[PDB]
């Protein structure tokens, strides 16, 4: 098992105990590479309510490496948290936060009542009700003009057929479970034929050439026999491949 | 559902006069505000709208020029400010709840709750 | 602009009968911007009655509603002491709310 000798931690966690989240219209994204990911420690905790993952098993996170890792975070409304999801419908899987159907990452979200709602109600959390078209997946949307709802023109003056296109959540702590806040965070995945720089915390063990051996050179994973190479790597080059485009 | 407005207020001709609605039991970016006005011995006028969330604004041309309407969402709060006050505004002036005009059932024609209507005197 | 106009300017009847009051306009309204409002003496107006008959939350069934086109009536089935009040009739239309004069039972 072979892996960059890193040893700083992703700040992981200063995603999810920031102070303030964003509105899902206008959702925050944190990138994240460079490190090292230790995903039990999201995964185990007892303070989560949904943790779900698409394209990846939740107990085999930590064996993996992925070129970026995406941190994405908002506050919506508990009942649209089944929104955030592949092939979803809804106002906010379609104005606000849209998934791809082949995403790859894990769903995050807690209740977040005791944080985010407040007695006369939070108005600080908005989200798109209107819009002309869905978004496409991880578009934002901050825009503030005028949905035209007709066919005459709105000219950016509110009235019959002519909305403000956001709309704010009434956060109270008097709501209902479906209408308390919940903190959401998305952790997209990418995966492409590139230099891995977030990996889990895995050990390496020592090089071994010219026996039979079951390898993992930073995510790349197979069985056969290791030997010098007389092949002129360019410096950005980090693997090869044959004829057959076989590793 | 509640709609609480501030004391009577006396002003002379020329003056302006401010009157608060603080609301609640409800979401309140989630409905217009409306004013509506009723001098001693007459029916009821609308005077315009203001939309919490976005601040904006619709006025009766009677008072168009003459009102101003604003609101403060961290209090729920609505005020009519109107200037230039002379004595044909004398006036109890309500505040009144109403649907936005994308309510798909046409809750934005009526006004289902009120407040307590506020006596001014020019 | 519209007229809104409301007949007759007084009712007058004894608690335990019925009431119908009418509003006229002058030009077409449709029944969904149709309301009636109920004003007791040193009291906000309040909702009886939208979309020419439906009844707000709250409001007896001894209340109802109907109308079409230009003639919209209100209809109390019998009346108790409470109903000696002030009713409106209100309309939208274009970008603004019109009140007719009031008719006092």
């Known amino acids: 098992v072979r892996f960059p000798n890193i040893t700083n931690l992703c700040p992981f966690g200063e995603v999810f105990n920031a102070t303030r989240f964003a509105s899902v219209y206008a959702w925050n994204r944190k990138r994240i590479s460079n490190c090292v990911a230790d995903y039990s420690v999201l995964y185990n905790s007892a303070s989560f309510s949904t943790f779900k993952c698409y394209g990846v098993s939740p107990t085999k996170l930590n064996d993996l490496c992925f070129t970026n890792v995406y941190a994405d975070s908002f506050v919506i409304r508990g009942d649209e948290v089944r929104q955030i999801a592949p092939g979803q419908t809804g106002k906010i899987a379609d104005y606000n936060y849209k998934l791809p159907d082949d995403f790859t990452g894990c769903v995050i979200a807690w209740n977040s009542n005791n944080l985010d709602s407040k007695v006369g109600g939070n108005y600080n959390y908005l989200y798109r009700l209107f819009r002309k078209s869905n978004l496409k997946p991880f578009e934002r949307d901050i825009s503030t003009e005028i949905y035209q709802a007709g066919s005459t023109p709105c000219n950016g003056v509110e009235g019959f057929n002519c909305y403000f296109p956001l709309q704010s959540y009434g956060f109270q702590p008097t709501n209902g479970v479906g209408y308390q806040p919940y903190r959401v965070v998305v952790l997209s995945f990418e995966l492409l034929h590139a230099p891995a720089t977030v990996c889990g915390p895995k050990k390496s063990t020592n090089l071994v050439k010219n026996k039979c051996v079951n390898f993992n050179f930073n995510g790349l994973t197979g069985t056969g026999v290791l030997t010098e190479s007389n092949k002129k790597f360019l410096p950005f080059q980090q693997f090869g491949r044959d004829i057959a485009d076989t590793t | 559902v509640q709609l609480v407005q501030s004391g009577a207020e006396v002003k002379k001709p020329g003056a302006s006069v401010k009157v608060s609605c603080k609301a609640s039991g409800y979401t309140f970016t989630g409905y217009y505000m409306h004013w509506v006005r009723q001098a001693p011995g007459q029916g009821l006028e609308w005077m315009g709208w203001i939309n919490p969330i976005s601040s904006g604004t619709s006025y009766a041309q009677t008072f168009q020029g003459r009102v101003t309407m604003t609101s403060d969402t961290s209090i729920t709060t609505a005020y009519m400010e109107l200037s230039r006050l002379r004595s044909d505004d004398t006036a109890v002036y309500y505040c009144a709840r109403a649907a936005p005009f994308y309510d798909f059932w046409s809750g934005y024609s009526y006004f289902d709750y009120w407040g307590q209507g506020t006596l001014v005197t020019v | 602009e519209i007229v809104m106009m409301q007949s007759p300017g007084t009712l007058s009847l004894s608690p335990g009968e019925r009431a119908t009051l009418s509003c006229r306009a002058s030009?077409?309204?449709?029944?969904?911007?149709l309301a009636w409002y109920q004003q007791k003496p040193g009291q906000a107006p309040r909702l009886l009655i939208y979309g020419a008959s439906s009844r707000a939350t709250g409001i007896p069934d001894r209340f109802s509603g109907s109308g079409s086109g230009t003639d919209f009536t209100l209809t109390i089935s019998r009346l108790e002491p409470e109903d000696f009040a002030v009713y409106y009739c209100?309309?939208?239309?274009?970008?603004?709310?019109?009140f007719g004069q009031g008719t006092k039972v």
């Open positions: 030009q077409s309204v449709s029944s969904s911007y």
């Open positions: 209100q309309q939208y239309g274009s970008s603004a709310w019109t």
